[PDB]
Every structure is written in structure tokens, then in C-alpha cells.
Amino acid sequence: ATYMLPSLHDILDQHTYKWIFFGGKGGVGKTTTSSSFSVLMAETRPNEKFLLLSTDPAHNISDAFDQKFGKAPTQVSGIPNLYAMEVDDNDAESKSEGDMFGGLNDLITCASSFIKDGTFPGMDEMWSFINLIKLINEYSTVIFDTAPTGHTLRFLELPETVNKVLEIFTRLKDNMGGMLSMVMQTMGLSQNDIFGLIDKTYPKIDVVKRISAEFRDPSLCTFVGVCIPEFLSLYETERLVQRLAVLDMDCHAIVINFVLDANAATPCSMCRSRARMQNKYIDQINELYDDFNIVLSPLRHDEVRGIANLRDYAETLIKPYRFCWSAN
Amino acid sequence: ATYMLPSLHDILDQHTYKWIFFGGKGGVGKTTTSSSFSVLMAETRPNEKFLLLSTDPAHNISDAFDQKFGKAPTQVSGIPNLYAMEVDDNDAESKSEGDMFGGLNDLITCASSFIKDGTFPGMDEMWSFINLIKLINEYSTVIFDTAPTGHTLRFLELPETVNKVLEIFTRLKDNMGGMLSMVMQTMGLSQNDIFGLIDKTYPKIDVVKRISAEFRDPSLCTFVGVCIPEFLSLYETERLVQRLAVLDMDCHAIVINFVLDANAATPCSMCRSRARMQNKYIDQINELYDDFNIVLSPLRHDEVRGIANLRDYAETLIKPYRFCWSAN
Ligand SMILES: [Zn+2]
């Protein structure tokens, strides 16, 4: 057994990556793992530039580094080549460009109603990603820290939506099922305005399609699961691994956090039992994900705050920590 | 603060109850709480008879008591007046009666297709409950241990389904929208067979409606939530409490299991941190569910097995355990 090494060295070594996602439902020290990895990845390659991108509304990355971040990418104090921002002049571009994506959103809703059986995903989920691409210096790799709750695959289901947006585009320009005429009547727009709107938006729909196709490429993009030795935490990563499989997303790495370093030899009786409780859930992962890199991160007394402790935490991601149940 | 007592004494005292449910997603020692409470409730009222009913497919109650159980209710060795069974001669009744509920299931599917917009819940979920009522000696109270995963409110959404079954019944006998004629043609049945089938089944649909209305009565039925001090465990009981609210189900009691009895004074550093981690999640419950009885059950070294330990565990459900952070 233990075919795969319990380390994130393969991912740190492989410099071909551009997008590294970090997903994990609940409080599993995900933002610690997301932050610490970015630091480690930055100081190991001091020549190349890197981005840390959080979709967490609680701004847990700013508390991890002990430094506030905004929508604009800001250099991390003490770690150059590492920039951090918070997702969810340029306001003048937003008004003019937002008008078209307003008009598009109107055109797809109208066009959908003539075919789509009471169904329409918003263009905001796509428009949000189209804004994100505009602010991507030239960073060697971008590290994604997904939301801890709600819908955490918001950017990873775009290729499903574009396919329907491009379906509408073909049906309009071919005038299939008399959709072009029905849209021209309802919205009161000219054929030049409709073909005009398709022309201006399509290029930005194409870069999304192509960038979303890079996520499906395992040499360009990888996903790292984060969890804890607890029943519900397993169940959530079971679904996540199955959800990335149907999306053609690569996941071969999982980080178990808050692992209690204790066994039968531990004098503390209360620790011996909590270790037995964890062993049951850590084994399941080993048996189930035998083709994954399963990284075990020890329990720390104080929660990780500052570049100093992030760097210290990061040691156990690449150099596997020697627990008591480790033979050597 | 602490308006409500951290005990299940109100529920043990109130003998007016007939149905006590125990719900809790994941491994939160739910079957320990379900078992131990039944034992405590049985030995406090030695005159009256009680039932312990598990819908868990893993048969975790049989391992808790250390005694196998079947579909038939079996007396617990050392605790008379307490019977335990596993849900999910009499086979001769099942064939003859199953034919009608086969015919009904056929009639509702057929009738639904003429109105219900591609929608039909199965009659098996109801038929399963109709079988359960037949085996309800005269037990003073029945203690329900719901499934730990999947759909754990299977019996508690029957009043939604019967309303539609009774909707079909009215529409048929009134011949509204020409449904009676359409059913008589498709299934090739006589008006006497349809009105004949309604007549034989309705009484059993009525006892379900009335028994399901007793669940909504807070003096006859109550729900007890079970969870652990962990992020995902909270989130799951948040949904459960909100789901029981829309169903008009009474829940004013929650049992937090595997509570580590440690604080700043605890010599063990590894225990001090795991106590700080738990404090964050235990407080949320106190702030949020200020109108609920929040019971704190201490962490035990060995998992509960046998009537001896169930009885010992049950002490801390009624007499609140003195933790270190308890002033006295
Ligand atoms: Zn300890």
C-alpha cells in the first residue's frame, strides 16, 4: 500500500500548472492550506509572479496573512511576487460594457423563453468570470480558494452555459424555428442590432470557453481537496470528487487537517479516544482514495496568523510530518 | 441567559407523548442517545410498555444493546416493557393486501398522468408506514431513531402525498375534467372496480392522515436533534430545525455529543486547543437556540455497548453533567 506519497511535491514541482483550485466544505482549515501553499510556491520560485484568489465572502485570507485585501491585487508584505485580492476609471468601462451584457442578458432570456422549458441560468455568473480574466500582470500560476458554503463550483460549470448561449447564436443567425423574427418583434430590435450584439460579445464568450477548457487539461490545472477526520467532512469530499469527475476536472490530492498526533502510547486518556475516533475516518480515505496524494497536517495549538506561521505550516505539505504511528 | 434547563427532564416527565423522534446527520452518537433514552424511559415507568424503532439500515441499535433485532419487536434482555425492531402467516396477508396497493399505485400513477405535470411520489413510502401501524401490543410511547443519511423525513411528508391521493379520489367520483372516463379507458377498469378500490383503501389512507396529524400535535409528539461541536454538524441541524418548522413539527431539544471536558486549566496542551475549537461551535448553539433545551453529553473513553453503559450514559441526559467551565 501507500503507492502515492503523502505530499504536495508533484504539484509544487510541476511548473506547467496555471490554475490550482482548493475546495473544502465547512471549517477544515482550507484558507490556511490555500494561503500557506501560495507562500511556499512563491518563495521557491522568486523569479515568477503568482496570484492568490479568494471567493470567500468572510475575507478569511486577509486574517490568515494579517493584511487587508480589496478587488485589486495587492502585494503580500514580506513576500514579493505574491498578490492577493477578494472577488465579489474602470467604473467608466463597466457602464459602457455592462450595457451590452445587459442587452445580451435581455436577448438570451427572450431567446430562451421561445425554446428553453422555463429554464435560464444568469449571464452574471459568466460576466463575473469575464471581469476576472481582465485582471489576469502575467501570473505564472493563479491559486483559487473556493467558497466554504453555497455553490463552490460557480466558474467550473460555465462550459455548460456557453454551449446554450452559442446554441441561441446559431439558431438566431440561421433563423431556425423562426426565433430571429420572434426576438425582433418582442424586444423591438433590428436584425443589424441582434447580429451587431452577437459580434461584440462573442469574442469574450470565446476566451471564457478556451480558459474553461484549460481547467479540464490536467497538465495546466489541478484541484486539491481539503477535509478533517469527521463523518460529514468525508461525505462532502465524496460528493466533491464525484462532481469534479463529471466536470472532467483533475483531483489526485487531498489535505486532512487537524490530525491529532496520538495513539495507544499517549498518556492522556482523552487524547487516546479522540485518536481512535480519527483513525476510523483517516483509514476510509486511505482505502478509498488509494490513487490520490493523501497529506496529513498535524493539529497546531494556536490558529495560523502571519507569513511566519503560514511558512511553518507549509513544511508539512511537502515534507510529510513524522506522527507517532509512523514507523520512522 | 440559560432560560431553558440543559436536560431532557421535560420530555421524560410529560407522559402525554406517544411519538419521540431522534434525528441527526452523520456520526453524532445518535443511536447511543436513541437507545439510552428508551432504557431510561422504560425503567422509570415499569408498568407501561415502550417501543424502540430504527430506520438505520446498518442496524446500529443491535450493536448498542449487544442483542440482534428483526422486523418483529423483541423484548430487550434485562429490560422488560422495552421492545426493539428493524424497519425496511403475515406473508399471506401481504400478497392479498399488496394486490390492492398494487392496483391503487397503478390507479394513482394513471390518474396523476392526466393532471400532475410529470410528477408522482410512490405509494411504497405510504404503504411502508401503513404496514408499520399494524404492529403498534399497546405501547405507551414509541421512540423513533431516524436514518443517519439520505432522506430522514420519509414518514413526516405523508400528509403532502395523501392530500393529492384524496384530490384524485374526489376528481374521480365527481368525474371532474373527464378523468374517470380516461382512467376507465386506459386501465380498462369498470366504474364499480374504481369506486370499489377507493372504498377498500381509503380507511387505511385515513388512519395515516390522522396518525400523521398527531405528529404535528406538540403534546403528543416531539423531535430531539443530535449533533457534535463541528462546523458541518451545526449546518445539518440548522436545516433540520428549519425543515421541522415548515412541516409544523415540534423541536425544542438538542443533544451535543462528544463534548471534551477541558479549558485553560487543563494541563494537556492538545486538549486545551480541541476545547477552544469546540467552545466556538457550542456557543453558536447557545446564542442561536436560546428557546431550546441544549443538553451537553461528555466524551467517554470506550463507545457505549450493553444495557449497563446505556443506563450510565442516560444519567447525563436528565442530570446535567458538571464540566470544568461549570461554576458549580
Ligand atoms: Zn489530551
XYZ file of C-alpha atoms and ligand atoms in Angstrom:
657
model
C 0.000 0.000 0.000
C 0.919 3.776 0.158
C 1.738 3.759 -3.639
C 1.277 7.598 -3.707
C 3.500 9.827 -1.452
C 1.646 11.776 1.315
C 2.975 15.135 -0.074
C 2.055 18.045 -2.467
C 5.583 17.890 -4.064
C 4.307 16.631 -7.505
C 2.093 19.810 -7.735
C 4.915 22.148 -6.466
C 7.485 20.552 -8.901
C 5.137 20.641 -11.984
C 5.557 24.332 -13.087
C 3.311 23.679 -16.191
C 0.221 24.443 -13.959
C -1.534 27.870 -14.359
C -4.699 27.241 -12.199
C -4.657 25.451 -8.756
C -8.109 25.209 -7.005
C -8.619 24.481 -3.238
C -12.138 23.195 -2.325
C -13.441 22.047 1.102
C -16.939 22.357 2.703
C -17.034 23.856 6.250
C -14.220 24.734 8.715
C -11.396 22.352 7.593
C -8.550 24.970 7.718
C -8.931 25.411 3.902
C -7.805 29.126 3.898
C -4.678 28.107 5.960
C -3.853 25.431 3.274
C -4.705 27.899 0.393
C -2.574 30.744 1.938
C 0.449 28.639 3.156
C 0.747 26.841 -0.268
C 0.794 30.217 -2.169
C 3.619 31.444 0.199
C 5.624 28.163 -0.263
C 5.035 28.249 -4.093
C 6.128 31.971 -4.205
C 9.428 31.746 -2.186
C 10.517 28.516 -4.063
C 10.207 30.421 -7.438
C 11.342 34.014 -6.630
C 11.636 34.989 -10.382
C 7.984 34.205 -11.427
C 4.782 36.060 -10.252
C 1.784 34.324 -8.505
C -1.863 35.274 -7.615
C -3.965 34.184 -4.547
C -7.733 34.453 -5.348
C -10.461 34.018 -2.620
C -14.259 33.805 -3.387
C -14.955 33.513 0.419
C -17.236 36.447 1.472
C -15.806 36.343 5.079
C -12.347 37.546 3.756
C -10.588 34.738 5.758
C -7.350 35.151 3.641
C -6.843 38.764 4.976
C -6.980 37.365 8.591
C -4.584 34.466 7.649
C -1.858 36.866 6.288
C -2.829 39.649 8.815
C -3.145 42.183 5.907
C -6.348 43.625 4.265
C -7.029 42.951 0.509
C -9.543 44.518 -1.972
C -10.877 43.761 -5.519
C -7.433 44.993 -6.807
C -4.485 42.543 -6.385
C -2.151 43.737 -3.529
C 1.495 42.571 -2.908
C 1.852 40.486 0.349
C 4.106 42.344 2.903
C 7.395 40.334 3.176
C 6.607 38.107 0.098
C 7.080 39.922 -3.262
C 5.815 38.096 -6.451
C 2.653 37.071 -4.439
C -0.517 39.244 -4.914
C -3.880 38.655 -3.095
C -7.420 40.041 -3.846
C -11.129 39.498 -2.863
C -13.711 38.569 -5.608
C -17.464 39.514 -5.301
C -11.558 54.826 -14.399
C -12.629 51.083 -14.573
C -16.201 52.157 -13.491
C -16.454 54.088 -16.853
C -15.603 50.826 -18.770
C -18.106 48.904 -16.509
C -21.042 51.241 -17.526
C -20.427 51.054 -21.353
C -19.512 47.286 -21.350
C -22.262 46.494 -18.745
C -24.881 47.986 -21.168
C -24.030 45.270 -23.803
C -24.034 42.389 -21.203
C -27.350 43.958 -20.069
C -28.578 43.778 -23.713
C -27.124 40.219 -24.122
C -28.740 39.051 -20.796
C -32.043 40.528 -22.195
C -31.507 38.798 -25.623
C -30.713 35.290 -24.141
C -33.685 35.432 -21.639
C -36.004 36.436 -24.577
C -34.444 33.771 -26.918
C -34.552 31.086 -24.112
C -38.336 31.675 -23.476
C -39.056 30.539 -27.126
C -37.165 27.172 -26.619
C -35.789 26.599 -23.039
C -38.603 24.930 -20.973
C -38.872 27.533 -18.124
C -35.035 27.437 -17.699
C -32.313 30.193 -17.738
C -29.010 30.483 -15.810
C -27.952 34.178 -15.399
C -25.200 35.863 -17.521
C -23.860 37.411 -14.214
C -22.062 34.097 -13.275
C -20.299 34.330 -16.717
C -19.945 38.198 -16.680
C -18.300 37.896 -13.173
C -15.675 35.484 -14.689
C -15.252 37.758 -17.814
C -14.327 40.646 -15.398
C -11.883 38.274 -13.545
C -9.950 37.427 -16.814
C -9.262 41.199 -17.455
C -7.110 41.315 -14.223
C -5.022 38.183 -15.209
C 0.171 41.435 -14.911
C 1.230 37.949 -16.221
C 0.996 35.499 -13.233
C 2.833 32.130 -13.738
C 0.098 30.311 -11.681
C -3.189 31.553 -10.043
C -4.177 29.736 -6.753
C -8.025 29.586 -6.302
C -9.569 29.468 -2.758
C -13.267 28.475 -3.375
C -16.173 29.478 -1.022
C -16.654 27.269 2.104
C -20.519 27.097 1.668
C -23.255 27.538 -1.025
C -22.280 26.852 -4.706
C -18.425 26.447 -4.773
C -18.196 25.300 -8.481
C -19.553 28.655 -9.854
C -16.749 29.126 -12.501
C -16.449 25.339 -13.266
C -19.958 24.951 -14.898
C -19.514 27.822 -17.476
C -18.877 25.436 -20.460
C -22.472 24.085 -19.878
C -23.917 27.684 -20.093
C -21.787 28.960 -23.088
C -22.916 25.877 -25.165
C -26.569 27.112 -24.776
C -25.550 30.807 -25.414
C -23.768 29.613 -28.651
C -26.849 27.388 -29.418
C -29.049 30.588 -29.331
C -26.446 32.434 -31.540
C -26.606 29.714 -34.310
C -30.469 29.484 -34.152
C -30.737 33.344 -34.492
C -28.268 33.788 -37.440
C -29.781 30.706 -39.261
C -33.366 31.843 -38.304
C -34.187 28.257 -37.097
C -37.753 27.703 -35.721
C -38.479 31.394 -36.577
C -36.650 32.597 -33.397
C -34.941 35.651 -35.064
C -38.389 37.086 -36.116
C -39.957 36.386 -32.634
C -36.997 38.184 -30.862
C -37.102 41.140 -33.377
C -40.880 41.582 -32.592
C -40.863 41.124 -28.738
C -37.703 43.230 -27.935
C -38.402 45.546 -30.957
C -34.736 45.269 -32.160
C -33.359 45.332 -35.779
C -31.519 42.319 -37.380
C -28.402 44.627 -37.502
C -28.709 45.259 -33.687
C -29.024 41.465 -32.929
C -26.149 40.436 -35.318
C -24.366 43.610 -34.039
C -24.703 42.488 -30.363
C -23.564 38.857 -31.152
C -20.441 40.291 -32.954
C -19.292 42.482 -29.967
C -19.917 39.876 -27.159
C -18.833 36.562 -28.871
C -15.032 37.206 -28.569
C -15.427 37.468 -24.719
C -17.654 34.281 -24.748
C -14.770 32.558 -26.695
C -11.954 33.440 -24.165
C -14.238 32.039 -21.350
C -14.793 28.784 -23.381
C -10.991 28.446 -24.023
C -9.909 29.371 -20.407
C -12.622 26.941 -19.060
C -11.171 24.226 -21.418
C -7.702 24.796 -19.767
C -9.305 23.800 -16.377
C -10.155 20.363 -17.966
C -6.432 19.997 -19.027
C -4.615 18.130 -16.190
C -1.090 19.484 -17.107
C -2.443 23.121 -16.900
C -4.928 22.806 -13.932
C -5.442 20.603 -10.782
C -7.896 20.583 -7.790
C -6.768 19.916 -4.141
C -9.489 18.663 -1.713
C -9.321 19.773 1.987
C -11.192 17.927 4.835
C -10.922 16.786 8.531
C -11.252 13.332 10.217
C -15.063 13.649 10.812
C -18.056 11.770 9.218
C -19.796 14.756 7.472
C -16.373 16.128 6.263
C -15.712 12.800 4.382
C -19.257 12.741 2.840
C -18.745 16.336 1.495
C -15.379 15.452 -0.239
C -17.019 12.208 -1.597
C -19.548 14.447 -3.479
C -16.800 16.989 -4.484
C -14.535 14.229 -6.022
C -17.630 12.787 -7.861
C -18.653 16.341 -9.035
C -15.111 17.103 -10.413
C -15.213 13.666 -12.209
C -18.417 14.577 -14.219
C -16.925 18.078 -14.990
C -13.696 16.379 -16.356
C -11.755 18.213 -13.546
C -8.465 16.634 -12.270
C -8.262 15.836 -8.489
C -5.487 13.464 -7.180
C -4.562 15.346 -3.914
C -6.445 15.637 -0.539
C -5.237 17.501 2.649
C -6.543 16.129 6.031
C -6.249 18.991 8.631
C -6.359 18.985 12.497
C -4.875 15.412 12.658
C -4.281 14.565 16.393
C -0.741 13.036 16.782
C -1.673 10.358 19.413
C -2.088 6.522 19.719
C -2.230 3.741 22.428
C 1.143 5.048 23.834
C -0.276 8.596 24.547
C -0.567 9.017 28.373
C -3.622 11.394 28.010
C -6.770 9.124 28.022
C -8.968 11.895 26.443
C -6.420 12.113 23.518
C -6.258 8.259 23.076
C -10.079 8.135 22.410
C -10.134 11.208 20.043
C -7.213 9.497 18.145
C -9.240 6.200 17.841
C -12.246 8.312 16.580
C -9.974 9.959 13.896
C -8.204 6.655 12.874
C -11.632 5.267 11.693
C -12.110 8.238 9.247
C -8.401 8.599 8.147
C -8.347 4.851 7.136
C -11.541 5.208 4.962
C -9.653 7.928 2.923
C -6.544 5.641 2.559
C -8.699 2.624 1.435
C -10.990 4.746 -0.843
C -8.514 7.266 -2.452
C -5.520 4.856 -2.925
C -4.634 6.678 -6.246
C -4.604 10.170 -4.522
C -1.790 12.013 -2.635
C -3.285 11.996 0.945
C -1.441 14.718 3.005
C -1.802 14.596 6.860
C -1.378 18.079 8.511
C -0.799 17.981 12.324
C -3.044 19.827 14.875
C -1.398 23.165 15.951
C -2.130 24.799 19.392
C -2.734 28.378 18.048
C -4.557 29.071 14.700
C -2.215 30.168 11.820
C -1.798 34.015 11.576
C 1.051 35.836 9.707
C 3.528 34.901 6.877
C 5.809 33.377 9.628
C 3.338 30.575 10.665
C 1.928 30.057 7.093
C 5.563 29.265 6.005
C 5.936 26.907 9.062
C 2.556 25.139 8.341
C 3.641 24.731 4.642
C 6.629 22.490 5.725
C 4.204 19.554 6.447
C 2.529 19.879 2.953
C 5.824 18.977 1.095
C 7.876 17.128 3.825
C 5.495 14.548 5.394
C 5.304 15.041 9.236
C 6.505 12.053 11.381
C 3.462 11.133 13.578
C 3.704 8.556 16.461
C 2.109 5.785 14.253
C 4.909 6.444 11.650
C 7.434 3.515 11.930
C 10.152 6.163 11.149
C -29.232 33.689 29.856
C -29.724 29.846 30.192
C -33.565 30.341 30.491
C -34.074 26.655 29.437
C -32.508 23.827 31.567
C -29.774 21.738 29.819
C -31.788 18.487 30.415
C -34.378 16.133 28.745
C -36.464 16.060 32.011
C -39.467 17.996 30.498
C -39.777 15.216 27.808
C -39.282 12.353 30.377
C -41.849 13.948 32.816
C -44.517 14.653 30.093
C -46.155 11.154 29.786
C -48.760 12.575 27.275
C -46.200 11.894 24.429
C -46.779 8.837 22.128
C -44.092 9.541 19.415
C -40.489 10.755 20.191
C -38.209 11.183 17.083
C -34.346 11.380 17.197
C -32.737 12.968 14.073
C -29.027 13.736 13.432
C -26.962 13.652 10.172
C -23.676 11.648 10.320
C -21.815 10.031 13.267
C -23.030 12.158 16.251
C -23.696 9.196 18.648
C -27.433 9.406 17.699
C -28.107 5.620 18.225
C -26.435 5.880 21.719
C -28.833 8.804 22.583
C -31.852 6.949 20.983
C -31.049 3.639 22.834
C -30.042 5.107 26.282
C -33.199 7.358 26.396
C -35.519 4.340 25.666
C -33.802 2.395 28.557
C -34.124 5.410 30.966
C -37.794 5.997 29.867
C -38.570 2.226 30.346
C -37.073 1.692 33.879
C -38.646 4.999 35.195
C -42.157 3.698 34.148
C -42.022 -0.096 34.810
C -45.871 -0.509 34.447
C -46.225 0.909 30.855
C -44.829 -0.661 27.589
C -42.424 1.170 25.156
C -41.117 0.589 21.557
C -37.644 1.463 20.076
C -37.882 1.828 16.240
C -34.732 2.195 14.000
C -34.868 3.031 10.213
C -30.996 2.820 10.084
C -30.006 0.091 7.536
C -26.682 -0.557 9.432
C -28.672 -1.993 12.457
C -26.608 0.210 14.879
C -29.235 -0.299 17.703
C -28.490 -4.110 17.818
C -24.742 -3.283 18.382
C -25.646 -0.619 21.051
C -27.721 -3.122 23.166
C -25.469 -6.107 22.122
C -28.606 -8.095 21.033
C -29.912 -8.824 17.456
C -33.393 -7.492 16.393
C -35.644 -8.306 13.359
C -38.810 -6.837 11.698
C -40.766 -8.304 14.707
C -40.481 -6.365 18.029
C -38.204 -8.289 20.509
C -38.003 -7.731 24.341
C -34.591 -6.242 25.447
C -32.687 -8.758 27.706
C -32.658 -7.272 31.273
C -35.252 -4.511 30.437
C -38.857 -5.831 30.172
C -41.539 -3.380 28.792
C -38.945 -2.265 26.122
C -39.212 -3.895 22.620
C -36.833 -3.150 19.661
C -37.207 -3.917 15.881
C -35.600 -3.042 12.465
C -37.765 -1.362 9.716
C -37.011 -1.833 5.937
C -48.877 -16.202 8.135
C -48.381 -12.368 7.644
C -46.915 -13.109 4.125
C -50.425 -14.444 3.130
C -51.997 -11.069 4.213
C -49.140 -9.202 2.361
C -49.995 -10.940 -1.009
C -53.811 -10.246 -0.888
C -53.446 -6.681 0.591
C -50.365 -5.941 -1.632
C -52.533 -6.677 -4.749
C -54.880 -3.723 -3.846
C -51.949 -1.306 -3.058
C -50.537 -2.574 -6.395
C -53.890 -1.669 -8.056
C -54.039 1.683 -6.135
C -50.378 2.528 -7.093
C -51.435 1.740 -10.741
C -54.643 3.893 -10.406
C -52.845 6.991 -8.888
C -49.955 6.863 -11.486
C -52.609 6.644 -14.303
C -54.785 9.407 -12.675
C -51.662 11.615 -11.992
C -50.534 11.446 -15.702
C -53.845 13.220 -16.717
C -53.189 16.185 -14.277
C -49.820 16.006 -12.365
C -47.141 17.697 -14.586
C -44.658 14.744 -14.873
C -44.821 14.258 -11.045
C -45.648 11.204 -8.813
C -44.310 10.179 -5.367
C -44.564 6.356 -4.849
C -47.292 4.668 -2.698
C -44.468 2.462 -1.186
C -43.383 5.319 1.212
C -47.056 5.389 2.444
C -47.592 1.550 2.196
C -44.372 1.082 4.321
C -45.938 3.327 7.062
C -49.367 1.528 6.708
C -47.531 -1.797 7.487
C -45.777 -0.089 10.494
C -49.162 0.988 12.082
C -50.400 -2.697 12.087
C -47.584 -3.599 14.606
C -48.453 -0.659 17.003
C -49.397 -4.583 21.622
C -50.377 -1.111 23.025
C -47.088 0.856 23.573
C -47.414 3.987 25.825
C -44.736 5.814 23.704
C -42.791 4.785 20.512
C -39.175 6.187 20.264
C -38.120 6.778 16.580
C -34.396 6.552 15.559
C -34.297 8.114 12.010
C -31.679 7.156 9.323
C -28.249 8.899 9.611
C -28.057 9.652 5.796
C -30.330 10.003 2.691
C -33.992 11.114 3.262
C -34.598 11.005 7.089
C -38.110 12.671 6.998
C -39.693 9.781 4.966
C -42.780 9.355 7.286
C -43.070 13.140 8.064
C -44.073 14.242 4.472
C -47.049 11.772 4.119
C -49.750 14.484 4.714
C -48.444 16.197 1.482
C -48.914 12.901 -0.518
C -52.344 11.830 0.971
C -53.791 15.321 0.066
C -53.012 14.540 -3.649
C -54.288 10.886 -3.309
C -57.572 12.318 -1.811
C -57.550 15.026 -4.585
C -57.553 12.175 -7.222
C -60.364 10.362 -5.254
C -62.688 13.475 -5.358
C -61.906 14.192 -9.083
C -62.713 10.502 -9.989
C -66.040 10.194 -8.033
C -67.177 13.694 -9.279
C -65.839 12.913 -12.837
C -64.051 16.347 -12.925
C -62.080 17.152 -16.147
C -63.299 13.769 -17.543
C -60.630 11.854 -15.515
C -62.934 8.895 -14.537
C -63.623 8.114 -18.275
C -59.880 8.470 -19.237
C -58.842 6.039 -16.382
C -61.683 3.549 -17.278
C -60.391 3.501 -20.940
C -56.559 3.351 -20.339
C -56.543 0.742 -17.465
C -59.703 -0.964 -18.911
C -61.409 -0.996 -15.439
C -65.173 -0.682 -14.582
C -66.620 2.268 -12.528
C -67.530 -0.389 -9.850
C -63.833 -1.557 -9.741
C -62.534 2.082 -9.361
C -65.179 3.074 -6.705
C -64.626 -0.470 -5.281
C -60.826 0.105 -4.948
C -61.289 3.629 -3.375
C -63.726 2.087 -0.780
C -61.273 -0.674 0.403
C -58.078 1.526 0.569
C -59.478 4.889 1.915
C -59.855 3.704 5.577
C -56.061 2.904 5.661
C -55.319 6.326 3.971
C -57.439 7.928 6.802
C -55.516 6.297 9.759
C -52.220 7.538 8.115
C -53.688 11.113 7.805
C -54.857 11.034 11.494
C -51.608 9.424 12.891
C -49.546 11.957 10.791
C -51.715 14.785 12.318
C -50.710 13.508 15.846
C -47.012 14.172 14.882
C -47.976 17.897 14.370
C -49.540 17.921 17.930
C -46.793 19.067 20.375
C -48.416 17.412 23.495
C -48.491 14.000 21.634
C -45.160 14.182 19.646
C -41.702 15.919 19.904
C -38.392 15.804 17.902
C -34.905 15.740 19.596
C -31.941 16.955 17.450
C -28.493 15.274 17.935
C -25.169 16.889 16.768
C -21.440 17.398 17.701
C -19.277 20.562 18.138
C -18.149 20.670 14.437
C -18.996 23.156 11.586
C -20.836 20.736 9.188
C -22.732 19.122 12.164
C -24.230 22.583 13.077
C -25.184 23.354 9.410
C -27.061 19.974 9.176
C -29.160 20.658 12.377
C -29.802 24.263 11.093
C -31.553 22.701 8.020
C -33.302 20.001 10.183
C -34.787 22.637 12.623
C -35.916 24.748 9.571
C -37.383 21.588 7.863
C -39.381 20.582 11.029
C -40.663 24.237 11.222
C -42.259 24.085 7.677
C -43.712 20.578 8.493
C -45.321 22.021 11.735
C -43.114 19.531 13.726
C -42.162 20.439 17.361
C -38.385 20.608 18.186
C -37.214 22.355 21.444
C -34.412 19.884 22.493
C -30.856 19.328 21.054
C -28.171 16.848 22.373
C -24.475 17.842 21.757
C -22.359 14.599 21.948
C -18.556 14.021 22.356
C -18.149 17.296 24.384
C -14.472 17.467 25.593
C -14.432 18.429 29.347
C -11.355 20.769 29.200
C -10.479 24.532 29.428
C -7.433 26.853 30.081
C -6.751 24.904 33.367
C -6.309 21.511 31.523
C -2.575 20.546 31.682
C -2.777 18.684 28.276
C -1.976 21.325 25.548
C -3.553 19.151 22.757
C -6.839 19.049 24.828
C -6.781 22.869 25.524
C -6.826 23.605 21.714
C -9.546 20.970 20.869
C -11.626 22.548 23.741
C -11.170 26.093 22.226
C -12.223 24.624 18.789
C -15.421 23.123 20.401
C -16.253 26.278 22.509
C -16.694 28.279 19.211
C -19.413 25.813 17.957
C -21.110 25.134 21.386
C -21.607 28.952 21.884
C -23.290 29.366 18.412
C -25.941 26.767 19.569
C -26.471 28.647 22.918
C -26.835 32.062 21.125
C -28.995 30.643 18.250
C -31.290 28.095 20.070
C -31.893 30.127 23.311
C -35.524 28.739 23.455
C -34.308 25.050 23.172
C -33.142 22.577 25.893
C -29.404 22.240 24.909
C -28.036 19.010 26.567
C -24.190 18.581 26.746
C -23.105 14.859 26.842
C -19.449 14.287 27.931
C -16.853 12.385 25.788
C -16.499 8.732 27.025
C -13.237 6.697 26.514
C -14.938 3.483 25.189
C -18.027 3.567 22.852
C -21.354 2.625 24.591
C -22.172 -1.158 24.371
C -24.685 -3.033 26.629
C -27.712 -2.010 28.822
C -25.167 -1.249 31.657
C -23.395 1.663 29.810
C -26.606 2.912 28.034
C -28.126 3.369 31.570
C -24.875 5.154 32.708
C -24.823 7.448 29.576
C -28.558 8.275 30.210
C -27.658 9.902 33.626
C -26.185 12.988 31.802
C -29.390 13.435 29.648
C -31.597 14.165 32.766
C -28.994 15.277 35.424
C -26.745 17.878 33.701
C -23.021 16.827 33.949
C -20.706 19.259 35.874
C -17.963 20.226 33.329
C -14.833 22.270 34.349
C -16.378 25.537 32.923
C -19.446 24.921 35.216
C -19.171 27.407 38.178
C -20.708 24.572 40.325
Zn -5.136 15.345 25.901
